[PDB]
């Protein structure tokens, strides 16, 4: 087990780091798993409006907004990276032309030159998080193994 450091953490609106959230003082005490904190966050990469879990349009999170990746040079290598980051099987198809509907929010990624072996889509060399003229009709989509 691991001793508990801090408790009663109350993050206000505006800080993006836990260090700026006021709370009870640091104390070294033994804590049972009942009062320990377990958090299951949703990864930045996700697919929406798909028949299965690992199918649908590709959406990423950056700067507090759920953006969408444009289908510029969106080949199977990019889909291989996306499916691997999602944690399911290898990609089956890399759809284009907003196959699974129009995405919401802005567009962060376009012309992603993934090599098919990147651990995450953020390691792919491309113009990232803005400076994109793509519309929502050009939203990329991914179809992975069930």
């Amino acid at each position: 087990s691991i001793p508990m450091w801090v408790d009663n953490v109350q993050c206000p609106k505006g800080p993006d780091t836990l260090w700026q959230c006021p709370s009870s003082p640091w104390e070294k005490r033994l804590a049972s798993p009942s009062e320990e904190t377990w958090i299951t966050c949703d990864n930045k990469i996700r697919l929406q409006e798909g028949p299965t879990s690992c199918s649908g349009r590709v959406e990423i999170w950056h700067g507090g907004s759920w953006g969408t990746v444009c289908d510029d040079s969106w080949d199977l290598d990019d889909a291989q990276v996306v499916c691997q980051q999602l944690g399911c099987g290898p990609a089956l198809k890399a759809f284009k032309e907003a196959e699974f509907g129009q995405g919401t929010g802005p567009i962060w990624l376009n012309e992603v030159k993934c090599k098919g072996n990147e651990s995450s889509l953020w390691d792919c060399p491309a113009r990232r998080w803005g400076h994109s003229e793509c519309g929502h009709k050009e939203d990329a989509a991914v179809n992975c193994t069930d």
């Binding site: 109350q10 505006g14 700026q20 959230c21």
Partner: protein, 301 residues
């Protein structure tokens, strides 16, 4: 494309005309903006959206001090009688051309983006606002750097007219007016931004507005920050933020925020702050600051 930008046009007894830009410094542009009620002039140019008919006559300004309440009060201005041969019209773009604001946010420097198009405020669709546009927005409102852009009407939906303009900000612009914008949504997709100056720190219980006990507001409650880690560098930044110059000495509930200012920060939002796990603090041992009160006074290394 707005009432505070474009080529200036002068009408005297119902006559079309403009102003020749001879000696058209920023002072005369500021005077024009002041008489027009559009803030302060920024750039002697504009993004062309409409066309103004050419006119034979011109308005010539010899010299204006800059503090004049109107162009007509400037000394020795000549209307007609000369020709704008080698010069052009006095193009201008005042600030309120794109005057933004943040509303619907509990903390100071966050809220739904609402850019005013001269007179009418309006929301912006989340797809027509990038990181560079948000960064300029936080900079213009002296709110530091941008933390996040929250789409889908995070701060609620603002009634009004949604602008279809898309800001092509480079990122280094000092105002949204200077940004090139490309005109061409729904209120459920209103864009909101969160800047980095969320501190909301003030001085309370002082004989002078530039003096008193340090109080800070987080979690929606004003509290009395104490001097466990309130060094003189922290006090220097607080006085600088409050436009009180520099600090001199440091004599609800108690917030335990630890401010790690280096002294050169212009606001508390820029200062690295650590509040997690901070130890308790004696009630009688609280933070306070006496500022110099001279805005001209500045710190030194």
């Amino acid at each position: 494309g707005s009432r505070c930008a474009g080529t200036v046009e002068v009408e005297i007894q119902r006559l079309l005309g403009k102003v020749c830009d001879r000696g058209w410094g920023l002072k005369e542009a500021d005077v024009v903006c002041r008489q027009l009620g559009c803030g302060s002039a920024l750039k002697t140019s504009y993004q062309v959206y409409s066309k103004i008919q050419a006119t034979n006559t011109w308005l010539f300004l010899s010299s204006c001090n800059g503090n004049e309440t109107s162009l007509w009060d400037c000394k020795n201005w000549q209307w007609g009688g000369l020709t704008c041969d080698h010069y052009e019209e006095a193009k201008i773009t005042c600030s309120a051309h794109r005057e933004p604001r943040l509303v619907g946010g509990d903390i100071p420097c966050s809220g739904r983006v609402e850019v005013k198009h001269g007179d009418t405020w309006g929301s912006i669709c989340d797809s027509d606002f990038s990181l560079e546009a948000a960064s300029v927005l936080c900079r213009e409102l002296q709110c530091g750097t941008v933390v996040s852009i929250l789409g889908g009407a995070h701060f609620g939906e603002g009634n009004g007219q949604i602008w279809a303009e898309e800001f092509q900000c480079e990122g280094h612009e000092s105002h949204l007016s200077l940004c090139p914008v490309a005109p061409r949504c729904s209120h459920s997709r209103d864009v909101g931004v969160v800047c980095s100056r969320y501190t909301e720190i003030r001085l309370v219980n002082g004989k002078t507005p530039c003096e008193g006990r340090v109080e800070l507001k987080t979690l929606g409650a004003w509290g009395s920050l104490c001097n466990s880690h309130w060094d003189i560098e922290d006090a220097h930044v607080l006085c600088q933020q409050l436009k009180c110059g520099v600090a001199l000495s440091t004599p609800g509930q108690i917030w335990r925020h630890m401010f790690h200012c280096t002294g050169t920060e212009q606001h508390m939002g820029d200062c690295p702050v650590t509040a997690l796990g901070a130890s308790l603090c004696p009630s009688e041992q609280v933070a306070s600051v006496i500022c110099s009160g001279n805005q001209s006074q500045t710190l030194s290394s």
